Amino acid sequence: STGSATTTPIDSLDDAYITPVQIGTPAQTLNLDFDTGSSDLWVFSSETTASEVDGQTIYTPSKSTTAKLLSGATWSISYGDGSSSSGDVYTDTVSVGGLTVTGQAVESAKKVSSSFTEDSTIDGLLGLAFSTLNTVSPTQQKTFFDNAKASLDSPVFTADLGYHAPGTYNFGFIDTTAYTGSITYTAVSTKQGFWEWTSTGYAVGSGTFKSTSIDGIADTGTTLLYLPATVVSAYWAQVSGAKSSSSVGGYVFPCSATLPSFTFGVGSARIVIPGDYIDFGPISTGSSSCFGGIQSSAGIGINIFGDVALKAAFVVFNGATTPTLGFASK
């Protein structure tokens, strides 16, 4: 089997992407944030504290003939941006782009933090990291991909995120028409539960490529590119008027600036992030200062290849017995 679903930016900055997911019988379609940096599939629901729901579409398990309560089970997650959610657990039938998993754990939110409430466009998350990060207790549950794997034509999914445009998540096949040139594959460590790999270096604009190992994670659920302070300083030093602002919370630059591209290494191959992808717009409405899309990872404890980087590539998440990552230009 295979599946193919379109993923759509939630706003004009590509802050996140939502993908329609069919849950239950008859189908309830919710727009979820596919997150390769976490491993829980959780949804706003009929159980979510009413005051914490503001415009989201909710899953109502009592209206699904295939929903089953996982007796005694609970879940609780905290994300890197400080947001969080928690609740109880159902299994139900879940379909993505035509691919169906029966008995998928669907984590029903009883409580969500303010940033989730305040985002009316995201109805929940669908985790695509390794199932070792799943937060269900007492017994951890498998991700959608883990459950689907044995049914898939090939044990892979691909992320093809758009710049200011829709893109695609495919399951079980590689669309050879979706990229230019060849896919370069690189090793993955699952030791921390992430799609963790080592970039071979970087270049700033037309500068010569610097060969240096940068360990990080491929994370579709993170908006920006977070890299070591050395690398980030080298980038913003090439932008007139750019500076790190502790009050704003990162590098800012004159909105009138022309941003250089940023290149990262995948083995001997290279992915070029155009300068425009690095512009995340005015720091506040009407400001002539803009927020940068490449920021320091110092204090995160990990480098994150988020959407700014991934949307410049066609990305293969190869869940074979020994997982790998593949990157192509497009």
Curated annotation (Swiss-Prot):
Peptidase A1 domain: residues covered: 17-328
Reaction(s) the record says it catalyses: Hydrolysis of proteins with specificity similar to that of pepsin A, prefers hydrophobic residues at P1 and P1', but does not cleave 14-Ala-|-Leu-15 in the B chain of insulin or Z-Glu-Tyr. Clots milk
Assigned keywords, A-Z: Aspartyl protease, Disulfide bond, Hydrolase, Protease, Signal, Zymogen
Gene Ontology biological process terms from the UniProt entry: proteolysis
Catalytic residues in the record: 35, 199
EC number: 3.4.23.22
Molecular function as annotated in GO: aspartic-type endopeptidase activity
Cystine connections: 255-290
Family under the similarity heading: Belongs to the peptidase A1 family.
Descriptive protein name: Endothiapepsin
